[PDB]
Write an enzyme that holds these catalytic residues in place. Structure first.
Site, mmCIF file in Angstrom:
data_model
loop_
_atom_site.group_PDB
_atom_site.id
_atom_site.type_symbol
_atom_site.label_atom_id
_atom_site.label_comp_id
_atom_site.label_asym_id
_atom_site.label_seq_id
_atom_site.Cartn_x
_atom_site.Cartn_y
_atom_site.Cartn_z
ATOM 1 N N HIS A 1 1.618 3.776 2.075
ATOM 2 C CA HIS A 1 2.283 4.362 3.239
ATOM 3 C C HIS A 1 3.809 4.193 3.186
ATOM 4 O O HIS A 1 4.348 3.351 2.471
ATOM 5 C CB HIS A 1 1.751 3.732 4.529
ATOM 6 C CG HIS A 1 0.368 4.171 4.902
ATOM 7 N ND1 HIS A 1 -0.455 3.424 5.730
ATOM 8 C CD2 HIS A 1 -0.335 5.277 4.562
ATOM 9 C CE1 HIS A 1 -1.603 4.065 5.880
ATOM 10 N NE2 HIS A 1 -1.561 5.181 5.177
ATOM 11 N N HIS B 1 -7.156 -1.549 5.991
ATOM 12 C CA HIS B 1 -6.264 -0.551 6.579
ATOM 13 C C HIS B 1 -6.108 0.653 5.652
ATOM 14 O O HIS B 1 -5.961 1.793 6.108
ATOM 15 C CB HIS B 1 -4.906 -1.209 6.885
ATOM 16 C CG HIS B 1 -3.781 -0.240 7.068
ATOM 17 N ND1 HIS B 1 -3.452 0.295 8.294
ATOM 18 C CD2 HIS B 1 -2.878 0.255 6.189
ATOM 19 C CE1 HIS B 1 -2.421 1.111 8.158
ATOM 20 N NE2 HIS B 1 -2.055 1.107 6.886
ATOM 21 N N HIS C 1 0.856 -1.182 0.000
ATOM 22 C CA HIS C 1 0.000 0.000 0.000
ATOM 23 C C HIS C 1 0.895 1.236 0.000
ATOM 24 O O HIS C 1 2.120 1.127 -0.080
ATOM 25 C CB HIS C 1 -1.041 -0.029 1.152
ATOM 26 C CG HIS C 1 -0.497 0.168 2.543
ATOM 27 N ND1 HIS C 1 0.041 -0.864 3.285
ATOM 28 C CD2 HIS C 1 -0.543 1.241 3.371
ATOM 29 C CE1 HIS C 1 0.370 -0.415 4.488
ATOM 30 N NE2 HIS C 1 0.048 0.865 4.554
ATOM 31 N N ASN D 1 -2.947 3.282 13.196
ATOM 32 C CA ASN D 1 -3.230 4.440 12.358
ATOM 33 C C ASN D 1 -4.306 4.104 11.331
ATOM 34 O O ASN D 1 -4.039 3.430 10.336
ATOM 35 C CB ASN D 1 -1.959 4.921 11.657
ATOM 36 C CG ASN D 1 -2.245 5.924 10.558
ATOM 37 O OD1 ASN D 1 -3.268 6.609 10.576
ATOM 38 N ND2 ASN D 1 -1.339 6.018 9.591
ATOM 39 N N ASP E 1 6.036 2.980 5.242
ATOM 40 C CA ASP E 1 6.661 1.711 5.590
ATOM 41 C C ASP E 1 6.558 0.686 4.470
ATOM 42 O O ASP E 1 7.069 -0.432 4.616
ATOM 43 C CB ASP E 1 6.051 1.144 6.880
ATOM 44 C CG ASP E 1 4.563 0.882 6.764
ATOM 45 O OD1 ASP E 1 3.865 1.613 6.020
ATOM 46 O OD2 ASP E 1 4.090 -0.059 7.439
HETATM 47 O O1 LIG Z 1 -1.074 0.954 10.907
HETATM 48 C C1 LIG Z 1 -0.733 0.900 12.118
HETATM 49 O O2 LIG Z 1 -1.104 -0.068 12.834
HETATM 50 C C2 LIG Z 1 0.131 2.008 12.719
HETATM 51 C C3 LIG Z 1 0.438 1.696 14.187
HETATM 52 C C4 LIG Z 1 1.365 0.494 14.371
HETATM 53 C C5 LIG Z 1 2.587 0.650 13.513
HETATM 54 C C6 LIG Z 1 2.388 1.200 12.121
HETATM 55 N N1 LIG Z 1 1.378 2.156 11.909
HETATM 56 C C7 LIG Z 1 1.648 3.182 10.915
HETATM 57 O O3 LIG Z 1 0.875 3.989 10.654
HETATM 58 C C8 LIG Z 1 2.897 3.273 10.109
HETATM 59 C C9 LIG Z 1 2.891 2.493 8.774
HETATM 60 S S1 LIG Z 1 1.210 2.046 8.241
HETATM 61 C C10 LIG Z 1 3.408 4.719 10.056
HETATM 62 C C11 LIG Z 1 2.580 5.548 9.078
HETATM 63 C C12 LIG Z 1 2.873 6.889 8.889
HETATM 64 C C13 LIG Z 1 2.123 7.645 8.002
HETATM 65 C C14 LIG Z 1 1.078 7.059 7.308
HETATM 66 C C15 LIG Z 1 0.783 5.720 7.497
HETATM 67 C C16 LIG Z 1 1.534 4.965 8.383
HETATM 68 ZN ZN LIG Z 2 -0.232 1.759 6.370
HETATM 69 ZN ZN LIG Z 3 2.285 -0.514 8.242
#
Ligand SMILES: O=C(O)[C@H]1CCCCN1C(=O)[C@@H](CS)Cc1ccccc1
Ligand SMILES: [Zn+2]
Ligand SMILES: [Zn+2]
Ligand SMILES: [Zn+2]
Ligand SMILES: [Zn+2]
Length: 231
Positions: free
Chosen positions: A84, A147, A82, A178, A86
């Protein structure tokens, strides 16, 4: 109990799941806390398919160095599941190293809007919920919005490994992460589609944290529905 947890930021660890299948694990700091992140590596002959970056350019350079050191086969293609950071953060590093980068057309558009790095190639055949396509040694599946609206999951048939990315939560996470970009209304139905299409999965890898079994799917549905009813 051997899955890594142990990892300073900037470093990347590989974990062999099966013959020719690894996960990659990296860390990032966000709001003063440290989070792990998983991706996948799958062997296809004498080359490697990479699923997702290691969450940033520096981590992704370390990922390629780790792969070179521990496996010694070239990463020739990569898929981001996706839009994002990561998942696409580090695509420019991959591209500079000669890796052909791929994502769905929806992921590429959303990455563009976000100002994130944009994979080069567009994956066809994944526009509708329930669509699946073969891509080298894996199957790519669009379960529907969860997600994010664009999220893909990845299945390795030879190993019964299901990589759910951030549409699937680890068991230790009991509150929603998130969800700014999520379709909470559709997420349980999308999980239902994963279960329907990969009921034989033996190893299920969440986007962040410890692998488990297919129990991670109903766990994620429980967390998402609890968040939906929050008040
Ligand atoms: O999904 C989730 O569970 C949340 C919480 C757990 C870790 C990952 N996490 C995140 O957000 C990450 C990658 S998805 C950082 C991000 C930043 C900006 C936009 C999207 C995501
Ligand atoms: Zn994400
Ligand atoms: Zn993620
Ligand atoms: Zn190309
Ligand atoms: Zn649970």
């Amino acid at each position: 109990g051997e899955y890594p947890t142990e990892i300073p930021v900037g470093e990347v660890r590989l974990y062999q799941i099966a013959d020719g299948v690894w996960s990659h694990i990296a860390t990032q700091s966000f709001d003063g806390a440290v989070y792990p992140s998983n991706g996948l590596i799958v062997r296809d002959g004498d080359e490697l398919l990479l699923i997702d970056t290691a969450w940033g350019a520096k981590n992704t350079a370390a990922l390629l160095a780790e792969i070179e050191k521990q496996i010694g086969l070239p990463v020739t293609r990569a898929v981001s599941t996706h839009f994002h950071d990561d998942r696409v953060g580090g695509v420019d590093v991959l591209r500079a190293a000669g890796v052909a980068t791929y994502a769905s057309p929806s992921t590429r558009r959303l990455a563009e809007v976000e100002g994130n790095e944009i994979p080069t190639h567009s994956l066809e055949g994944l526009s509708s919920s329930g669509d699946a396509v073969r891509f080298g040694p894996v199957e790519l599946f669009y379960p529907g919005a969860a997600h994010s609206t664009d999220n893909l999951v990845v299945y390795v048939p030879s190993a019964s490994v299901l990589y759910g990315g951030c549409a699937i939560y680890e068991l230790s996470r009991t509150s929603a992460g998130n969800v700014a970009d999520a379709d909470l209304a559709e997420w349980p139905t999308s999980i239902e589609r994963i279960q329907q299409h990969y009921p034989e999965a033996q190893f299920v890898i969440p986007g962040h944290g410890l692998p488990g079994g297919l129990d991670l799917l109903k766990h994620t549905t429980n967390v998402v529905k609890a968040h939906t009813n929050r008040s």
